[PDB]
Design a protein around this ligand. Sequence first.
Ligand code: BGC
Length: 229
Amino acid sequence: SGKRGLAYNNINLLTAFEGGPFSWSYNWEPRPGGYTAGIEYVPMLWGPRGYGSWNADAEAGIAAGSKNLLAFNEPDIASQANMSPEAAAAAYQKYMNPYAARARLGSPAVSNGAPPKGLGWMQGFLDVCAGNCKIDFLAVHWHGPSGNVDDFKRYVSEAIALGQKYGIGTVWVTEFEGQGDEEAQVNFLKEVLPWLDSNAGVERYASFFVDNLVKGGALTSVGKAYKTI
Ligand SMILES: OC[C@H]1O[C@@H](O)[C@H](O)[C@@H](O)[C@@H]1O
């Protein structure tokens, strides 16, 4: 309890979830797009496109009571932030480290791609950081067929171990998606949600994602499961 997050594009779609066991929200942007009473909004520095406004964006979100900031979104993937580990280590020290006295700082969020993507990219990043990146938690993503639940638990375990190796005590799984039809998607949530709630190495997580769990303004059967399990 208190771990479950709302990852959104349309802030209006959050209403369907009002009353459920949610503590936090993010929107892959530096600004929320509106106001949600009773939930922590966590601003994100997505990539180099956000460098210009980030100081302003980070001051605003902390003034509104966020305790956490998130760095770049899938820098290992060419259609997302598309940064080398070297460039990301230099950017993290310039734009993330300055706010450490006033917020806990999240790593760039890697995919579950095969090394040298994914957790391979995150090794590369910690190597170039070389102890000079201030990181409170690792941010990681997993997307795959609902039948590969065992691969999803191996991936989250290996992320927890990698952080501990570099004295980062927890992970946030800021996207996961057990893919398939609605029955397969609910079966995946029925397994992983209790396992993530019991896992001491996972501080926070968000299924991917609010706008796909709502039809009109009604929860799908997947959204209903994300609310009630
Ligand atoms: O569709 C959900 C979100 O997915 C992410 O992969 C993109 O980086 C965001 O900018 C987009 O809003």
